[PDB]
Design a protein around this ligand. Structure first.
Ligand SMILES: [Zn+2]
Lengths: 49, 49, 96, 48, 347, 169, 48, 169, 216
DNA sequence: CTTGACAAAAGTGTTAAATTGTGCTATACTGGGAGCTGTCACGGATGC
DNA sequence: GCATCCGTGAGTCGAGGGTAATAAGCACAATTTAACACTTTTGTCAAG
RNA sequence: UCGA
């Protein structure tokens, strides 16, 4: 339940990442980020009731 | 008596509790396997039983 | 709490109880001398250390804080005496 | 995998996401060094 | 429920966009107005911005512009009206450049308003900063104004470019000047950005977060563990005292913070006792030396007195005062070891 | 020095707030990230609210209780007990005068009850949505002459003041 | 909160139902509501 | 003159004659209509409040905004090298920010639209400092749900300065 | 048993769910219904009126019974304000006290009436102004019993026409929030609301109550 | 208590090295966005 | 007048455990601050 | 989230 919303925040982390830089060659390595997921998981286990 | 620059911040066992020591955990920054929070040199954790 | 090594809180209903007994200086002390009063707890401590009777407090502190807080809302709150004349509770501090 | 629709540029490179806390044998996670636990929840099931 | 954002959205929605024609016409009318001001500066022998603002005073409202700049900026009847009267003395060729000027001035406003629909769309990808929607968009429009005044249509470039470059800046500056509660100057923000950037990169690669060794290694020359750790320490922002606690919604943060900047009730009687017992133990010294001691340590005027000064009013030489306070000091040292009253206060 | 038996609460005029204020805080800063000292015009500024250390002036030219209350010539702080930073208030002068939200959103809205405007319309006005008439000066809309306290809209205002036009393609 | 465009009701109201992301009806919900309504359902959405 | 915003309300309020409205509402109360007498009463009550208090209604639209002393809204570092601060500081900060930017683009002669919008933002910021969440979605620190506690937020409430730091201690 | 919620329903002077109609004047009771709706007329010599009642609700009165003001026609609880405007303040106090003590004694808790009585007096301590006469008061204005009492007292000596008024009963909340001291209501609740009107009127606390002194 | 000779502490002026503030980038970019439910009683302003 | 919407509450002290996260960047003027060369006092010593 |  948290994994999906975090992965959605990352899903839009991909969007604005696609519309800039160099549309020709960008490996998925540059298209993927830690934060919108890892923070979403870190927010859960620590602060969830 | 000159009061030197450095003074005593030492952690003393809080009142209402005390006893022997079964263990001591020493973690100083720059040591292997341990990453200490930025701007902080040492952390010491005593087990009082 | 025990952690901060502080004293107990006097509840609103404890206050009510003290009012019910009609103990004036007990409740007065609870609200001033031993709680938030600036020179209250100090002069008291000195009085006990010197073997005297603790004098009567003046300013609650947090009441004054309440006053200035109100002033932040542009509420003009003045303490009159018996004649409707202003009395400084801030003891010549912010007078300007 | 990164797949270009029109360009037909197919570039597949495995990436990294992050760290996901695992569970012990007794079913207790360890967060910040002090092991914690997740209680079950209850709400009326979906549907009509 | 009266959304502040829909207000602005529909407010900019009232004024339509501008095609090539309208845009070029606008810019040309503007530059024409400004150069008109340039000639009008030679007319009455005045400055550019002077007459330029005097025009505004007659256009974007009359009394209101000079009424609330704040308590003092420029006088309305004095340094303004006389500029109106002084430029009224001029013939056709001159007096017409005035109308040209004000016309260009209006054209500037129309230009800014027409392209506002861009600036709004610029600050939407810029959300999540230390500032909200309108707060960001406005500080972007501030960049739109400068994007206007510096724009040249003669280069045949669509204004949507030159404007966007100034908005993209104005916002990224607006964050540097607001952001965290504590003020962080630009360069610091920059270096921080570079650091986090590197972090994001080598963490994407290595499959885990770096160390101050490797992250400063990838940062180039002069970058060591201690520095990246330092700037990382400065990076964090203060924590609100209204921070909740655990399961309890009632428990706050700041109620856990003690006041050590005010004397504790014990410390009052402490300093009192010291200042008293010291005065008692002081009376066993010669009328001179006892005074000299408290004159030296500042128990009198609250300030240290050099041997020269202590000897100046006593007529004695500095050396004398020195020997005096030494001797007196040890003569105190005799009684103190006996009474053991002041042997306390050892911290 | 006097018994206080009475406490009055009233409205504070802008002049009164000016009187309370030791200065206008302009710079929206707290403290420099290095010095950790109150910024020039910052919300913590010593030059107005008073010194952090008792009797110790900001710059450090005046220190002890000897000279007291006299403002220094460098930083401009006053030499006095550090307690003043508790009781000393500032002010912020607004370019466009704003309203205290209490009287606006109070259940029996005081402005709305006085000026006789519903909270619904007063909301539109105070928050910059719809205009309100001040001395129409012979102005008339839709055959019915417009009067003070009446609300207008975006188009209607510039239509009365700047005129009604029609643009055709 | 915005002018009633025809594509604006197409890209908005579609999400509240047909979008499997912003609308996800639990497997238990889909299944139970499927058997309790005496009918059947394809995805986890309200409409296709 | 259609002028809109809190400034206008300040104008009308400043022009008010309380005595005239007093007598007019007195004669308005004498009306036999069961409705009219009531509303006339309730309005005359506020009018009389202002008359008896001796306070001017135009003060409700505020120019100079009072600022709470540093020790009342403290910022201090705890053990471990952290920093802690009050939300009121951030509120004030955003307020004065919007205010200064306002003055800047105002005296600059920027287009009326942006100016007006900025005025609105100033109003809602002032409100955020006075009573936060009283209108619209409450202002929260970026990333966090928790609303910023303002003056009114501190005064009123279960944990408010009265029920917490006054009526018990 | 109605229990604590009843006690609160009383102390707050709230409208009963079971609320029973009472005769506004002293008439004779005349029961009239064709079978649609139950109607009960109560008619004095020159006056008259009827009460619309559901057929289901059981009444306490018989056709041809001479009754008085405030006397209940139907079974169940009675709206405090209704009998305040029907019989008078005395009967009100009596009813309130007797009902609170009813619940308490029913639960097996013994207490002296004085306690309840003080609160009860605190409830109706406010009055509504009607035809202020020679006084600065306005129609519909609300003020304490003692205040208007003294106003009339002095008005008589001045020869001026006194102030006619009506007793006004209210719950402990609406009572306490209406108190002379602004610090009291500010401490209580509705703070944001209280301080507004307080500051507007510029009201000035004499520190008469003990709680507003507890603040001080 | 004094007189002269001196090390160290503390001063004062100019400068090297950082830190901080400001400006501009011209292909063309022209209206955001996230939603969240299983209260409850009451009192007043507002709308039919 | 009669349905609806907004606003305000709702128990008392404790016990703990506490803190996450930034994708613009570069060139240069403006100060500020650390560096440093040398001056004037200040403190200390020896002998009177 | 437990103690009374
Ligand atoms: Zn100074």
């Amino acid at each position: 339940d948290q994994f999906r919303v975090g992965l959605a925040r990352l899903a839009r982390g991909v969007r604005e990442r696609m519309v800039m830089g160099s549309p020709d060659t960008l490996t998925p390595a540059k298209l993927v980020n830690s934060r919108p997921l890892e923070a979403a998981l870190r927010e859960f286990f620590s602060r969830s009731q | 008596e000159k009061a030197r620059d450095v003074k005593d911040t030492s952690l003393r066992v809080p009142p209402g509790e005390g006893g022997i020591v079964v263990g001591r955990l020493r973690l100083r920054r720059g040591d292997p396997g341990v990453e200490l929070k930025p701007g902080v040199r040492e952390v010491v954790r005593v087990f009082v039983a | 709490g025990k952690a901060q090594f502080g004293g107990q809180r006097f509840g609103e209903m404890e206050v009510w109880a003290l009012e019910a007994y009609g103990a004036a200086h007990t409740l007065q002390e609870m609200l001033t001398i031993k709680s938030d009063d600036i020179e209250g707890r100090n002069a008291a401590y000195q009085a006990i250390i010197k073997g005297e009777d603790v004098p009567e407090p003046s300013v609650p502190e947090s009441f004054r804080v309440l006053v200035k807080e109100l002033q932040a809302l542009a509420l003009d709150v003045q303490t009159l005496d018996e004649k409707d004349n202003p009395v400084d509770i801030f003891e010549g501090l912010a007078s300007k | 995998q990164l797949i270009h629709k029109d360009t037909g540029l197919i570039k597949e490179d495995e990436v990294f996401l992050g760290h996901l806390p695992l569970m012990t044998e007794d079913g207790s996670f360890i967060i910040n060094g002090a092991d914690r636990v997740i209680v079950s929840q209850i709400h009326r099931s979906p549907g009509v | 429920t009266s959304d502040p954002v829909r207000q602005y959205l529909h407010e900019i929605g009232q004024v339509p966009l501008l095609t090539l024609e309208e845009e070029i016409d606008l810019a040309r009318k503007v530059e024409e107005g400004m150069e008109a001001i340039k000639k009008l500066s030679e007319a009455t022998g005045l400055d550019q911005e002077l007459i330029r603002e005097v025009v505004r005073a007659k256009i974007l409202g009359t009394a209101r512009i000079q009424k609330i700049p704040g308590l003092k900026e420029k006088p309305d009847p004095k340094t303004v009206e006389e500029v109106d009267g002084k430029l009224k003395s001029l013939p056709k060729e001159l007096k017409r450049y005035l109308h040209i000027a004000r016309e260009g001035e209006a054209a500037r406003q129309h230009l800014i308003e027409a392209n506002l629909r861009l600036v709004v769309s610029i600050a939407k990808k810029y959300t999540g900063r230390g500032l909200s929607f309108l707060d960001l968009i406005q500080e972007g429009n501030q960049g739109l104004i400068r994007a206007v005044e510096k724009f040249e249509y003669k280069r045949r470039f669509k204004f949507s470019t030159y404007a966007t470059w100034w908005i993209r800046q104005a916002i990224n500056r607006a964050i540097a000047d607001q952001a965290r509660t504590i003020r962080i100057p630009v360069h610091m923000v920059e270096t921080i950005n570079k650091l986090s950037r590197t972090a994001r990169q080598l963490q994407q690669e290595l499959g885990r977060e770096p160390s101050y060794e490797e992250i400063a290694e990838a940062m180039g020359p002069g970058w060591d563990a201690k520095r990246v750790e330092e700037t990382l320490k400065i990076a964090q922002e203060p924590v609100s005292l209204e921070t909740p606690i655990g399961d309890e919604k009632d428990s706050f943060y700041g109620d856990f913070i003690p006041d050590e900047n005010l004397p504790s009730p014990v410390e009052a009687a402490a300093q009192s006792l010291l200042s008293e017992e010291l005065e008692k133990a002081l009376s066993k010294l010669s009328e001179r030396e006892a005074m000299v001691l408290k004159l030296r340590k500042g128990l009198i005027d609250g300030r240290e007195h050099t041997l020269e000064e202590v000897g100046a009013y006593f007529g004695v030489t500095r050396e004398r005062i020195r020997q005096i306070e030494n001797k007196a000091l040890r003569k105190l040292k005799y009684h103190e070891s006996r009474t053991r009253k002041l042997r306390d206060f050892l911290e | 020095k006097k018994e206080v038996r009475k406490v009055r609460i009233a409205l504070a005029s802008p002049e009164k707030i000016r009187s309370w204020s030791y200065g206008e805080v302009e710079k929206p800063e707290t403290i420099n990230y290095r010095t950790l000292k109150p910024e020039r015009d910052g919300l913590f500024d010593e030059r107005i609210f008073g010194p952090i250390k008792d009797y110790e002036c900001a710059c450090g030219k005046y220190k002890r209780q000897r000279f007291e209350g006299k403002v220094c010539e460098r930083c401009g702080v006053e030499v006095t007990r550090s307690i003043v930073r508790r009781y000393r208030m500032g002010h912020i002068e607004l370019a466009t005068p704003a309203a205290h939200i209490w009287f606006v959103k109070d259940v029996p809205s005081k402005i709305g009850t006085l000026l006789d405007l519903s909270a619904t319309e007063l909301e539109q006005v105070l928050y910059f949505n719809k205009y309100i008439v001040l001395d129409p000066k012979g102005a008339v809309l839709d055959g019915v002459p417009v009067e003070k306290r009446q609300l207008l809209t975006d188009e209607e205002y510039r239509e009365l003041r700047y005129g009604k036009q029609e643009t055709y393609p | 909160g915005d002018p009633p465009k025809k594509d604006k009701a197409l890209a908005y109201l579609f999400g509240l139902l047909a979008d499997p992301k912003r609308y996800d009806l639990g497997e238990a919900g889909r299944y139970k509501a499927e058997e309790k309504l005496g009918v059947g359902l394809s995805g986890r959405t309200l409409v296709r | 003159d259609a002028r809109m915003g809190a400034e206008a309300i300040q104008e009308l309020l400043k022009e008010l004659d309380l005595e005239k409205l007093e007598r007019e509402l007195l004669e308005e109360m004498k009306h036999p209509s069961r409705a009219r007498r009531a509303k006339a009463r309730k309005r005359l009550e506020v009018v009389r409040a202002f008359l008896d208090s001796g306070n001017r209604p135009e003060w409700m639209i505020l120019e100079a905004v009072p600022v709470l002393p540093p020790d009342l809204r403290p910022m201090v570092q705890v053990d471990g090298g952290r920093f802690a601060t009050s939300d009121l500081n951030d509120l004030y900060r955003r307020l004065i920010n919007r205010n200064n930017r306002l003055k800047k683009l105002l005296a600059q002669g920027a287009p009326e639209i942006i100016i007006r919008n900025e005025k609105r933002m100033l109003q809602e910021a002032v409100d955020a400092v006075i009573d936060n969440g009283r209108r619209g979605s409450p202002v929260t620190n970026p990333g966090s749900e928790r609303p910023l506690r303002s003056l009114t937020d501190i005064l009123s409430g279960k944990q408010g300065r009265f029920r917490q730091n006054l009526l018990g201690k | 048993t109605q229990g604590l919620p009843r006690v609160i329903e009383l102390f707050e002077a709230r409208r009963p769910k079971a609320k029973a109609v009472i005769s506004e004047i002293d008439g004779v009771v005349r029961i009239e219904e064709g079978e649609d709706r139950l109607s009960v007329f109560v008619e004095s010599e020159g006056f008259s009126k009827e009460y619309k009642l559901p057929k289901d609700a059981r009444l306490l009165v018989k056709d041809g019974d001479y009754v008085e003001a405030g006397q209940p026609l139907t079974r169940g609880a009675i709206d405090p304000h209704q009998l305040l405007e029907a019989k008078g303040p005395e009967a009100v106090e009596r009813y309130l006290v007797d009902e609170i003590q009813k619940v308490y004694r029913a639960q097996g808790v013994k207490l002296h009436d004085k306690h309840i009585e003080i609160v009860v007096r605190q409830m109706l301590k406010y009055v509504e102004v009607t035809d202020p006469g020679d006084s600065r008061l306005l129609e519909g204005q609300v003020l304490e019993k003692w205040d208007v009492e003294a106003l009339n007292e002095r008005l008589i000596a001045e020869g001026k026409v006194p102030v006619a008024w009506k007793p006004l009963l209210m719950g402990v909340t609406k009572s306490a929030l209406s108190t002379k001291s602004w610090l009291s209501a500010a401490s209580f609740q509705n703070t944001t609301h209280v301080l507004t009107e307080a500051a507007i009127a510029g009201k000035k606390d004499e520190l008469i109550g003990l709680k507003e002194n507890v603040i001080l």
